[PDB]
Design a protein around this ligand. Structure first.
Ligand SMILES: CN(C)C(=O)Cn1cc(-c2ccc(-c3cncc4ccncc34)cc2)cn1
Lengths: 264, 330
């Protein structure tokens, strides 16, 4: 699907207010600091990226899975459903929505086991504990708690349209595309329309590559104060990236994270 | 795995299809999609009929996924509206809720051919099918399986005579474009247009234009029936026919000479549709063998056929009494 964003469920229900988002986060902020909570969000973004790469899924599928994961925890506590179970469930659902297909029971469980064992052993000393019955249960909860909103718009399609319109596809697109991937280390996908994220990423790419695009950006007629807000977040994410050592910090942060309560 | 209090809260608050609707023994439809029930609310807040679609199999299949994803976004008077989704946690069945459509083209056509369709109704039906598919096509959504059984028509009530395109989850190849039968790998906007052409011909004659007796894309008997109606395409008519994966099979199994006295004019004339009518000229533009030479939905809507008397109406029945019987309980 490629519908009008202004009539989409993404815009009408999943473009949230930063303050309403901070208010819902308070429930988990009793155990984790604000800093540890964003670190945990980056970690699971990287877990979803590693899961998708193993399964050889297109960036569109990984981005859809990441947005599902974030939308779920924007409304619910980290203790509701284990994020270790939610991450491969989000990949499983996104692969179906994005017409890639049903990942087999064997392929999904082996992908989650292998990825956590190979690429995330520093944070998980024990093997992936879930089986297919856990994913199928989690899937039903995920679909329900997203109000069956499956179509997700990403900054990749408008970014490609902007860069092509500039006539700078060879030079700017590889860097701007990489910045869009990095954007998933933040909450931007929950706060701003994708075209706005794409423009800010293209802006940061122009600044890094030292290309004058002032006139092209000036002829757009978009809320530049909103593009500037996104730019500030992008610049902040690289400072966060520099100071964050995922491999040395995550076992402790995961241990502080609230765990699902068992039946009495 | 999951928090106890979280599960218990959701379980207490979750609306169950069996608590909200009475549908036991109210099955009206069956197929690949699943099952369809004509239900009534258990709480007397409404007396209107509702359609409950129990999806085939357990969990979220690709079909169930496509229907939920798209219908959650799509908003058009000629595309069926999804009102609610029920996720039955006990048996893992998915239920989709819509307003009940008393009629469909499969039952309407069947009623008329059993007699052996008013021309104003035919025109209004086609205009609403094209309006609905144009909206889908503008949103880059391809139906991939249009047929009379999927073109629903609303009965008595606030939407009387309104067409609703159903089945967004996508044995008989009567509505399948010739390029699909020759191995075209992808579905296109043109494939949906061919299907609309088939439906239009059937609305004008009460007969499926490419009716054929009963897993690879190549279907010989179906192609033979297309050629018996349309004639064998000349090289000039469909230049890229040589690029089709089954072109060599087509050359091996057929000879263009067999279909020399075959044409859509000859076929339509046997069923009393005039070759100089605006209806025929539009039908011929929809049923073009070469997909790149097939008219678009927007161009079809602009056809002078819709400007000729009578104009298409929002109620396809145009305030006249519906002769079609109500759907029977299976
Ligand atoms: C094997 N057999 C002979 C049959 O199944 C006979 N049959 C039954 C149908 C049928 C078609 C559409 C609906 C329906 C109504 N109202 C809203 C709907 C919303 C979504 N989907 C379907 C809806 C119900 C029944 C067609 N043919």
């Amino acid at each position: 699907m490629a519908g009008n964003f202004w009539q989409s469920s993404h815009y009408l229900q999943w473009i949230l207010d930063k303050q309403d988002l901070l208010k819902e986060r308070q429930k988990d902020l009793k155990f984790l600091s604000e800093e540890e909570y964003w670190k945990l969000q980056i970690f699971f973004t990287n877990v979803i990226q590693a899961l998708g790469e193993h399964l050889k899924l297109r960036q569109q599928v990984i981005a859809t899975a990441t947005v599902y994961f974030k939308r779920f925890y924007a409304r619910y506590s980290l203790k509701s459903i284990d994020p270790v179970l939610m991450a491969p469930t989000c990949v499983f659902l996104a692969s179906k929505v994005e017409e890639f297909g049903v990942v087999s029971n064997t392929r999904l469980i082996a992908a989650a086991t292998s990825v956590l064992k190979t690429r995330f052993s520093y944070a998980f000393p024990k093997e992936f504990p879930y089986r297919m019955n856990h994913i199928l249960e989690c899937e039903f909860y995920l679909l329900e708690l997203m109000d069956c909103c499956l179509i997700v718009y990403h900054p990749y399609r408008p970014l490609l349209q902007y860069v092509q319109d500039m006539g700078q596809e060879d030079m700017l697109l590889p860097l701007a595309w990489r910045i869009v991937n990095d954007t998933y280390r933040t909450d931007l996908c929950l706060l701003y329309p994708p075209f706005m994220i794409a423009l800010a990423c293209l802006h940061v790419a122009c600044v890094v590559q030292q290309k004058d695009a002032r006139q092209w950006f000036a002829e757009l007629s978009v809320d530049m104060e909103k593009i500037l807000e996104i730019i500030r977040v992008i610049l902040k994410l690289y400072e966060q990236w520099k100071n964050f050592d995922e491999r040395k910090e995550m076992a402790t942060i995961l241990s502080k994270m609230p765990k699902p309560k068992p039946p009495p | 795995s999951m928090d106890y209090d979280f599960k218990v809260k959701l379980s207490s608050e979750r609306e169950r299809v069996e608590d909200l609707f009475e549908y036991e023994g109210c099955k009206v439809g069956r197929g690949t999609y699943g099952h369809v029930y004509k239900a009534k609310r258990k709480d007397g807040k409404d007396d209107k009929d509702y359609a409950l679609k129990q999806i085939e199999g357990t969990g979220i299949s690709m079909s169930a996924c496509r229907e939920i994803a798209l219908l959650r976004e799509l908003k058009h008077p000629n595309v069926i509206s999804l009102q609610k989704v029920f996720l039955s946690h006990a048996d893992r069945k998915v239920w989709l809720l819509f307003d009940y459509a008393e009629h469909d083209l499969w039952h309407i056509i069947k009623f008329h051919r059993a007699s052996k369709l008013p021309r104003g109704m035919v025109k209004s039906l086609l205009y609403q099918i094209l309006d609905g598919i144009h909206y889908l096509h503008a949103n880059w959504v391809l139906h991939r399986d249009l047929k009379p059984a999927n073109i629903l028509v609303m009965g008595e009530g606030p939407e009387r005579g309104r067409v609703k395109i159903a089945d967004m989850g996508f044995v008989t190849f009567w509505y399948r474009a010739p390029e699909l039968l020759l191995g075209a790998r992808h579905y296109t906007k043109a494939i949906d247009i061919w299907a609309i052409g088939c439906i239009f011909a059937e609305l004008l004659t009460s007969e499926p234009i490419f009716h054929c007796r009963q897993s690879n894309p190549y279907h010989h008997d179906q192609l033979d029936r297309i050629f018996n109606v349309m004639g064998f395409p000349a090289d000039k008519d469909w230049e890229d026919i040589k690029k089709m994966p089954e072109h060599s099979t087509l050359m091996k199994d057929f000879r263009r000479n067999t279909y020399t006295n075959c044409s859509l004019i000859k076929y339509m004339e046997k069923h009393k549709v005039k070759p100089d009518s605006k209806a025929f000229h539009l039908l011929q533009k929809l049923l073009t063998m070469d997909p790149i030479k097939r008219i678009t939905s927007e161009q079809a809507m602009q056809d002078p056929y819709f400007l000729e008397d009578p104009l298409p109406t929002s109620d396809v029945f145009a305030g006249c009494q519906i002769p079609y019987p109500k759907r029977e309980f299976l």
